[PDB]
Amino acid sequence: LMGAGLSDLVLIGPKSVRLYANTRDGFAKGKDVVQSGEITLPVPGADPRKLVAFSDVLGSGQAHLVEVSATKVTCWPNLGRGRF
Amino acid sequence: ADWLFYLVFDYGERSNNLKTPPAFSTTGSWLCRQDRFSRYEYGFEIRTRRLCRQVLMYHHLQALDSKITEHNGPTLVSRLILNY
Amino acid sequence: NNNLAFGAGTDTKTSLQASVSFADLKIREDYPASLGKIRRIKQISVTLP
Numbered sequence A: 001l002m003g004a005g006l007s008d009l010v011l012i013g014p015k016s017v018r019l020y021a022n023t024r025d026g027f028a029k030g031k032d033v034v035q036s037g038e039i040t041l042p043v044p045g046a047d048p049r050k051l052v053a054f055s056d057v058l059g060s061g062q063a064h065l066v067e068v069s070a071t072k073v074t075c076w077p078n079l080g081r082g083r084f
Numbered sequence B: 001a002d003w004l005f006y007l008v009f010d011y012g013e014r015s016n017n018l019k020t021p022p023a024f025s026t027t028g029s030w031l032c033r034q035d036r037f038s039r040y041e042y043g044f045e046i047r048t049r050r051l052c053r054q055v056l057m058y059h060h061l062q063a064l065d066s067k068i069t070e071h072n073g074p075t076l077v078s079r080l081i082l083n084y
Numbered sequence C: 001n002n003n004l005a006f007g008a009g010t011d012t013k014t015s016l017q018a019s020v021s022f023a024d025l026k027i028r029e030d031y032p033a034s035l036g037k038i039r040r041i042k043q044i045s046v047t048l049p
Helices: none
Strands: A009-014 A016-020 A031-034 A050-057 A064-068 A073-076 B006-009 B038-039 B044-050 B056-058 B076-080 C001-008 C016-019
Touching: none
Parallel strands: none
Antiparallel strands: A009 A016, A016 A031, A050 A064, A064 A073, B006 B056, B038 B044, B056 B076, C001 C016
């Protein structure tokens, strides 16, 4: 989520994410990132009828948060540092 | 008025056919590409939705030559067509 | 019985209720009668996606 090529530790809630940056020897102090506007994020594992995963579906070179259901695919862009 | 040479990048704003040269000064919209894409590594969406269709070179012949009046526009001396 | 509504208690009016009829779930129909007629609930768990 830092966009550093490293895997950061994160917990996703619907309005915020708790992010611990990977500093390549351990992790950084966790930060709570509050999402802007009225953005609501999917929480993986929350609903058995849909897939929630981090993947690059825009082709930008960053994993984005993606929700796949029977009727649509919704992508929340990764703007870095836990911001969506 | 102050420059002798112009290099112009056309994003689909003016005709690129073989029947008439394009004018230096034109109007109208550019063309929107189908493979529109975005990038997020700078913390914001940067989105590309057009592409250069032709590159064309103009000379301010009025300024360069002698006995020239009217200043009707830079005159195309050559162009490059790009098809995609 | 198959409905959504707000409650009418004195401290439940802001409580959103959902109700269903067991009769309309057609659970019994899933298995043949010959396997027994006594069909009773042992446990219920709830998932809220």
